[PDB]
Design a protein around this ligand. Structure first.
Ligand SMILES: CCC1=C(C)/C(=C/C2=NC(=C\c3[nH]c(/C=C4\NC(=O)[C@H](C)[C@H]4CC)c(C)c3CCC(=O)O)/C(CCC(=O)O)=C2C)NC1=O
Ligand SMILES: CCC1=C(C)/C(=C/C2=NC(=C\c3[nH]c(/C=C4\NC(=O)[C@H](C)[C@H]4CC)c(C)c3CCC(=O)O)/C(CCC(=O)O)=C2C)NC1=O
Ligand SMILES: CCC1=C(C)/C(=C/C2=NC(=C\c3[nH]c(/C=C4\NC(=O)[C@H](C)[C@H]4CC)c(C)c3CCC(=O)O)/C(CCC(=O)O)=C2C)NC1=O
Ligand SMILES: CCC1=C(C)/C(=C/C2=NC(=C\c3[nH]c(/C=C4\NC(=O)[C@H](C)[C@H]4CC)c(C)c3CCC(=O)O)/C(CCC(=O)O)=C2C)NC1=O
Ligand SMILES: CCC1=C(C)/C(=C/C2=NC(=C\c3[nH]c(/C=C4\NC(=O)[C@H](C)[C@H]4CC)c(C)c3CCC(=O)O)/C(CCC(=O)O)=C2C)NC1=O
Ligand SMILES: CCC1=C(C)/C(=C/C2=NC(=C\c3[nH]c(/C=C4\NC(=O)[C@H](C)[C@H]4CC)c(C)c3CCC(=O)O)/C(CCC(=O)O)=C2C)NC1=O
Ligand SMILES: CCC1=C(C)/C(=C/C2=NC(=C\c3[nH]c(/C=C4\NC(=O)[C@H](C)[C@H]4CC)c(C)c3CCC(=O)O)/C(CCC(=O)O)=C2C)NC1=O
Ligand SMILES: CCC1=C(C)/C(=C/C2=NC(=C\c3[nH]c(/C=C4\NC(=O)[C@H](C)[C@H]4CC)c(C)c3CCC(=O)O)/C(CCC(=O)O)=C2C)NC1=O
Ligand SMILES: CCC1=C(C)/C(=C/C2=NC(=C\c3[nH]c(/C=C4\NC(=O)[C@H](C)[C@H]4CC)c(C)c3CCC(=O)O)/C(CCC(=O)O)=C2C)NC1=O
Lengths: 49, 160, 92, 173, 48, 160, 161, 160, 161, 161, 160, 161
């Protein structure tokens, strides 16, 4: 299996930032889940921050 | 509904909707006048469809209401009929959506985990929905009873 | 653990491939099959050989055999190379 | 996603009540225009490869900069044919998901499959947002050229294209 | 309006290859040093 | 066909067909003969229609007919009507099995690489099918040609 | 914070084009309902305290959130409710005049459901209070005006859910 | 607009809108028919309002166009008129919004930082808008010229 | 992922010294309670479904998170709870055996409160469910064993807060 | 916030040893370039507005971020740029004098790329503005001084990426 | 330890611990009194176990200490014994943890990369640990020497 | 990922102009050093393990990061270093051939200093290892080739700082 990069395949607009984050060596240190929160905040309103 | 999953089907396949998909969205919206009449019958018959629904349920399953049954006493029996009011409501959604997609993600997905975790016999609640089905199809003609009963037995299938 | 916890219809994890494999199963088949891709003509990926013969475990033969026919494959021969038959204890 | 119907049913489920008549009046407004929503969709499939072509020439006739070198800003407009090939491809998507969303009678399919990360993706590639939104409504005027003698098909066609316009904007006001 | 955001990292899409380029990239892709052939490969192009 | 799409699409989820899908089979089978009656109308007009298709595909595109073009010569033009005959034959299949797969498993999937290895300009074949749809309107009344209209423009959408 | 005119101008400006026939077509549609919205916002300003008194007595007055242990027991907690329900009936009035729900999520919705979870405020009883408050608001302003004011109530209920 | 800041005024004060606020939203929407006519006059007079706008601007400020001026040459003079087309556009927004709120957050907030950072004399661009004002009010009656000129001089005030 | 022995070995190793009298003094203290922890983890494995059924019925069964609009309304959402409460009762069992709460924040706590805020899960009702689940766990395993199993429940409740 | 002398003293202090020959060897290397950095920071202070005017006109002046819809359209948004570019040319001047880029990530880089994503500011056009600003800065201060000032520009561009 | 990987084993399998896992955590903690006595013997015998450990190591591998050997001179020979003090320490950890998990992630994982990158003969350091093993097992009874020697030979196995 | 020729073509293409005398002037300057870079990359490939063995023994071999508690104590942690130092000596070889440090920040620098802070890897000792590794690399390839290979080492050290 290879990593299906940006210049491999027709990518999708929905996980653009996350997938570029995941295809980095810095991926195994985001101990907080990056994708399950991002796909869920797409539906909920703006968070408090 | 049929509109939303005919879209997400053709969405995944990187294509538009075929005539097979667009001659049925077309065929469904002309069916929409007849669907609201059917759901309108079940809407203000919930007093009889639920109360007679729990009628046959206790006559067929006296264990669940007997002392030791899950729906024992004045309290649980009220909630015993509350769930039937839920599932009767979701069938009204499925009739108007033209699919069990509303019934799918409400009251069907992971339903065995809830009722197993509540101590309720899941087979018993399946018997309750079947008793509601005979009351519901008795309120409509043959052309309609092939639909209103049609959504109940799907709920019967997924509930076991 | 194993794939038969109590999952069936109307359960929270989605209805899927349920194999009758025990805890850490050690039975595996030797299968042979062709599986034409049927998707290369709108994806235009590189081509790979479709005739394969490999050892699949008992824990996941059924999923694989259920999937090989999903994409029009034909199974030419399968055998149970490793493991016993009618064995109550010892498949682990 | 959610059509006009499922979006209506979730509206009454959150409150946990049956469908009243105000709820059913919203469903009936879809079922009336539902037959009209299809030949809008059927016209798009017959006019699809054309309607992208008129949109491109109407776009670059006003934005000749998009067919020129970018300037030292490494910006993705339709400079090269590799850039031009992919850039026409985006007009495919805006016509497509705005074609389903005409049939659903609701922009739920739009934002979750087009809008979510759209400013994300274009900010990465430095893509024009200004001209990108203008081509979305060049399609809207082009499609409304066909249904023009009456004016109840016009509000139907405008709703998807107008939703992408207001949402892709950095809000000036 | 979109109520979330994944971020936009600086990505440079590919434009072309060069003889000076790709075999610096092939030996890179395997996580190995330049080999004598592909490094003699880099040489005789800069002699052109 | 349409039932095959429902059996397949219900088979990858490991479930029986739901309430909405069984509508989609039931409504399709009730409109059965009208496709059967329609295809016999078109089969009696295949020599009707392809003669009219060669009218306007070549007055629009004399590049192909002229000496040097692909269709120059008798035997090149001889199969030229044959490709119309196979396409029109395919559409009778698609009009019957009420969806696009006989137009897609044949004809559409990989058509460009077929023509590109043949020298036929792929843009010209799009106008050929558009010419063929223009020709079918004359030998067909207004009732049933919009029944067959969505099957033609799928081919144009498939070829681009 | 955009009204219907601000949203129309933004979308027409964000493409750098003038206000064509389609942009002015919606603007004319907003000016037609301009007379209806003011009278709707007129009576709601008059019966602000009466509407909130009707909603709480009709939805959550006697439920056991009102009793001890419920989420609304102490007088500070009860007084926070009618203060809290006043914003929903007030900001919904602003959305009804502006013709655009941008002010709601800008000033109400963001950090709202994340705040009630912190305090432990029941979102279920909150939406039914707003639903009951939507029901009485259709009484005063009429049917179509209630359809307009009601269109922003469930927008709050949807996002607050 | 008057609608959005009459709201955010009463929004901050924890109250609804008074009769003083609601008898003016009412009074503004009945004024809306007359506003679109006024903005419609300036919409397709930008060719004369801008070109004659830069007419008097160069006759009154030849320094900015002379060699050494900021708008010197064929290039800068084109952009020299581009900004006037901007500010003439924002006045059409303010007339339809019934307020300088569109002109406020576009072309007015921090305008001195831009033009000081571009080397442009901010007093010179103020002279340009005044020249456009005499051309604009010359195109309308007295009742309208008290409005169209009214938004220009606000832009003159904030631009110095 | 360290137990009491792993944590003792790490601190004694991180200074490069041998296991002196103080390091073995705590290790002997852990081996003394080794008999108590297994029987505590024994009965918890047996009554896993019964404990979770007791906690939800005692804390959040009939509250309006259970009713429509509440955070637990739909059957998928209800089924996610007992799935979710199973991890807290399970991972707390692991901490009770390992004698060190390192496994909790390693595999449960990190990204947890940041995840519930994303989904909009009420942290207030979650902790009270775990508190009620801690109360029934002291019923089964006894007092001191409940003190041990209870010592990791509030560790989850503290960090999840 | 450490300069070259602070970083040398910290590393020599963090091991508890005196300033040996290697620590003073780098310090002598910093004092040799002390004359170059002040004159570099001298001219940059003089031509601060001229450098930023040259960079924006050379990189992103006429691109469609400048036009309507682009990220820099409104005058508030344009004015924020030259305010924003002033910090990059200013803080880079501080790094050039201190000889250590610790001040950049302390006061510029942290929460910067996470902030532009919030506002939706294009990081691609930002770096090219700084690259063009780095190009003009090498014009004024010379080659080697431009090498020094340029060494902190791409440090901003690297971390901001 | 046996406690932490009997957990992470049953952790991955989505299950609790079996009797086979819980009758050994039980069996290990009752073994804990005897383990501390064994580690207590090696704790204050490191003077004799290391120094006699390097005794036989140089008599069996004089190359490593001869001029040209890696541990040549007063300097390297001190570090030559330092590593043996390390590995003797890790064996005391493995005895108390009841497993080579402490020895695994300290001194064993990637050990060949270190010693190959230091120029040290990895076979030579394996000979050193074997010489320590005969000294260690000579200090204990037969029941203990089957353990203390048992952890050394695992280190011998992984160190080649 | 651009070499000197790719960067020259990009800047000449990004303005839409041909390769004028200035663009080819730098390209001729790169082709002149093409012979030097290959021989520099030749010997570095041969002495890859020897260079890394020399750097660690000269910079951080006996410091107390090597001892217990230090950042490099366990054999997994020590083995990660020479694995980690191999990339710096390898990717610097790629930059030396490509004549452009774009590959470093593309594949090494981004998320690097943010990763070492997560693991707690000392950035101070890391740069001195690369500085010592730069010192031995100038031994092999010579002076000017060491100037070329050394020009990308401190680029890593600058951005990693
Ligand atoms: C819309 C889909 C949906 C369903 C179905 C649903 C069910 C549901 N059933 C419940 C209880 C209950 N349900 C029953 C049901 C029964 N007893 C019997 O003997 C019969 C076999 C059966 C009814 C026909 C009983 C006795 C309780 C109370 C159990 C207890 O108090 O421990 C509860 C907890 C109390 C509450 O919040 O109502 C829920 C959430 N929720 C949903 O969202
Ligand atoms: C969709 C077409 C299809 C079929 C039919 C199929 C069958 C199939 N049946 C299996 C086992 C089995 N099948 C049976 C069945 C029976 N025992 C009896 O006495 C009866 C005669 C019979 C029931 C009617 C049993 C007991 C096993 C388990 C065998 C074992 O554990 O050794 C297995 C091994 C793996 C697993 O169950 O997970 C497969 C793959 N796979 C397919 O893809
Ligand atoms: C379904 C919704 C959706 C959209 C819209 C989408 C867009 C999208 N546009 C892209 C590129 C692109 N898009 C353009 C587009 C343009 N250039 C201009 O100058 C014009 C303003 C504009 C045409 C209107 C260009 C040039 C690229 C390539 C950039 C480059 O490589 O230089 C890419 C990267 C290549 C790829 O597709 O993998 C994506 C993902 N993805 C989606 O999922
Ligand atoms: C069922 C789907 C299907 C199709 C369509 C098909 C086409 C097909 N077209 C062919 C040739 C050809 N086709 C054309 C066609 C044309 N010239 C024109 O001007 C026209 C626009 C067009 C016809 C309407 C020409 C000129 C050749 C001969 C090219 C050559 O061999 O020199 C050939 C090579 C052998 C042959 O003629 O049979 C095939 C296989 N095969 C298939 O299985
Ligand atoms: C909508 C509000 C708004 C305004 C006003 C605006 C102005 C603006 N004026 C510019 C340039 C300019 N503007 C001028 C203007 C003038 N020269 C003179 O002598 C006169 C006094 C004056 C015009 C009447 C010149 C000469 C330039 C080019 C300066 C240069 O090239 O350095 C530029 C940079 C190039 C560009 O992107 O157009 C902007 C952004 N942007 C906005 O968004
Ligand atoms: C092992 C450590 C760990 C935890 C704890 C965890 C939690 C977790 N809880 C979830 C959802 C959920 N959790 C709940 C829980 C609750 N609702 C309430 O009212 C109560 C307060 C609470 C029960 C105590 C609900 C209802 C959902 C579904 C949310 C949704 O569908 O939007 C989800 C989303 C995906 C899914 O459930 O499949 C995750 C990942 N993941 C982990 O890896
Ligand atoms: C000292 C370290 C530091 C930096 C760098 C910083 C940046 C920063 N840039 C901002 C906005 C901004 N920054 C820009 C910048 C740009 N637009 C473009 O197209 C270009 C690519 C770019 C100019 C190079 C714009 C337009 C805004 C306004 C955004 C808005 O109004 O939404 C804001 C919002 C608040 C404000 O400007 O008052 C902050 C806080 N803060 C700091 O403390
Ligand atoms: C806890 C696990 C562990 C081990 C094993 C370890 C080994 C280790 N051995 C080292 C050196 C050394 N090790 C030796 C070892 C030997 N020479 C011989 O002839 C013999 C075959 C062999 C010893 C029996 C020598 C000579 C050096 C110094 C090498 C030099 O100075 O170049 C060094 C570098 C200096 C230092 O920091 O001590 C380390 C880190 N570190 C660890 O964390
Ligand atoms: C190609 C660009 C690139 C780099 C540079 C990179 C680094 C990187 N270094 C790592 C660890 C590490 N790096 C070191 C390094 C050091 N300890 C010290 O004392 C020294 C200062 C330093 C050696 C110079 C150590 C000890 C670890 C292990 C940390 C741990 O186990 O916690 C890890 C964690 C995972 C693993 O090693 O398998 C990554 C991903 N990844 C990349 O993709």
């Amino acid at each position: 299996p290879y990593i299906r990069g940006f210049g491999e395949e027709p990518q999708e607009c929905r996980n653009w930032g996350t997938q570029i984050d995941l295809f980095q060596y810095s991926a195994p240190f985001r101990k907080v889940p990056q994708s399950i929160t991002l796909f869920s905040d797409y539906l909920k309103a703006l968070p408090d921050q | 509904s049929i509109v939303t999953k005919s879209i997400v089907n053709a969405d995944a396949e990187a294509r538009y909707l075929s005539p097979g998909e667009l001659d049925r969205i077309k065929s469904f919206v002309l069916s929409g006048q007849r669907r609201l009449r059917i759901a309108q019958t079940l809407t203000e018959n919930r007093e009889r469809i639920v109360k007679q629904g729990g009628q046959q349920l206790f006559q067929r399953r006296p264990d669940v209401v007997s002392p030791g049954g899950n729906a024992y006493g004045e309290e649980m029996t009220a909630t015993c009929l509350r769930d039937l009011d839920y599932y009767l409501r979701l069938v009204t959604y499925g009739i108007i959506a033209g699919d069990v997609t509303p019934i799918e993600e409400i009251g069907l997905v992971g339903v065995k985990e809830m009722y197993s975790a509540l101590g309720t016999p899941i087979s018993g609640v399946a018997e309750g929905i079947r008793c509601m089905k005979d009351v519901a199809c008795s309120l409509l003609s043959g052309e309609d009873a092939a639909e209103v009963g049609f959504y109940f037995d799907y709920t019967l299938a997924a509930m076991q | 653990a194993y794939d038969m916890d109590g999952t069936g219809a109307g359960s929270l994890e989605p209805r899927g491939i349920k194999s009758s494999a025990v805890e850490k199963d050690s039975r595996c088949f030797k299968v042979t099959f062709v599986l034409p891709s049927q998707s290369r003509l709108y994806t235009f990926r590189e081509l790979q050989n479709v005739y394969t013969t490999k050892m699949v475990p008992f824990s996941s033969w059924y999923a694989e055999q259920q999937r090989i026919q999903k994409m029009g494959g034909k199974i030419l021969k399968v055998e149970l190379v490793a493991g016993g038959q009618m064995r109550s204890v010892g498949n682990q | 996603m959610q059509d006009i119907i499922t979006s209506v049913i979730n509206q009454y489920d959150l409150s946990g009540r049956y469908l009243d008549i105000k709820g059913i009046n919203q469903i009936n407004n879809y079922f009336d225009t539902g037959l009209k929503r299809l030949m809008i969709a059927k016209l798009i499939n017959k006019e699809a490869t054309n309607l992208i072509k008129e949109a491109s020439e109407l776009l670059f006739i006003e934005q000749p900069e998009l067919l020129r070198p970018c300037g030292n800003a490494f910006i993705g407009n339709a400079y090269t044919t590799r850039r031009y090939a992919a850039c026409i491809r985006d007009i495919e998507y805006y016509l497509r998901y705005s074609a389903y969303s005409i049939i659903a009678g609701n922009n739920s399919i739009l934002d979750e499959r087009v809008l979510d990360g759209l400013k994300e993706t274009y900010n990465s590639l430095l893509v024009p947002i200004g001209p990108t939104i203008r081509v979305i409504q060049l399609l809207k005027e082009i499609i409304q050229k066909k249904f023009s003698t009456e004016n109840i098909e016009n509000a139907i066609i405008a709703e998807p294209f107008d939703y992408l316009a207001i949402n892709l904007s950095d809000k000036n006001l | 309006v979109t109520k979330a955001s994944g971020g936009s990292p600086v990505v440079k899409p590919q434009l072309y290859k060069t003889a000076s380029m790709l075999t610096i990239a092939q030996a890179e892709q395997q996580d190995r040093f330049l080999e004598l052939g592909e490094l003699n490969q880099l040489v005789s192009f800069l002699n052109t | 066909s349409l039932v095959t799409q429902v059996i397949l699409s219900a088979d990858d989820e490991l479930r029986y067909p739901t309430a909405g899908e069984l509508e989609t089979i039931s409504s399709y089978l009730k409109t059965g003969e009208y496709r059967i009656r329609l295809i016999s109308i078109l089969q009696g007009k295949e020599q009707e229609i392809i003669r009219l298709a060669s009218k306007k595909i070549f007055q629009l595109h004399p590049e192909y007919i002229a000496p040097g073009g692909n269709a120059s010569g008798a035997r090149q033009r001889a199969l030229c009507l044959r490709d119309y005959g196979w396409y029109l034959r395919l559409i009778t299949y698609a009009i019957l099995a009420g969806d696009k797969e006989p137009l897609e498993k044949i004809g559409i999937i990989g058509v460009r690489e077929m023509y590109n290895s043949l020298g036929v300009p792929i843009i010209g074949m799009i106008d050929a099918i558009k010419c063929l749809k223009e020709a079918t309107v004359e030998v067909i009344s207004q009732e049933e040609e919009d029944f067959v209209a969505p099957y033609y423009d799928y081919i144009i959408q498939g070829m681009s | 914070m955009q009204d219907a005119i601000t949203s129309v101008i933004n979308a027409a400006d964000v493409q750098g084009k003038y206000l064509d026939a389609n942009s002015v077509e919606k603007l004319r549609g907003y000016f037609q309902t301009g007379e209806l919205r003011v009278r709707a916002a007129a009576t709601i300003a008059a019966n602000a305290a009466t509407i909130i008194k009707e909603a709480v007595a009709k939805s959550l007055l006697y439920s056991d959130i009102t009793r001890p242990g419920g989420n609304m027991y102490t007088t500070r907690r009860y007084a926070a409710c009618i203060r809290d329900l006043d914003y929903y009936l007030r900001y919904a009035t602003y959305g009804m005049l502006a013709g655009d729900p941008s002010i709601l999520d800008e000033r109400v919705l963001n950090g709202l459901k994340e705040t009630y979870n912190s305090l432990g405020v029941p979102i279920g009883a909150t939406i039914q209070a707003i639903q009951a408050m939507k029901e009485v608001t259709g009484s005063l302003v009429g049917s179509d005006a209630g359809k307009e004011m009601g269109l922003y109530f469930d927008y709050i209920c949807s996002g607050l859910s």
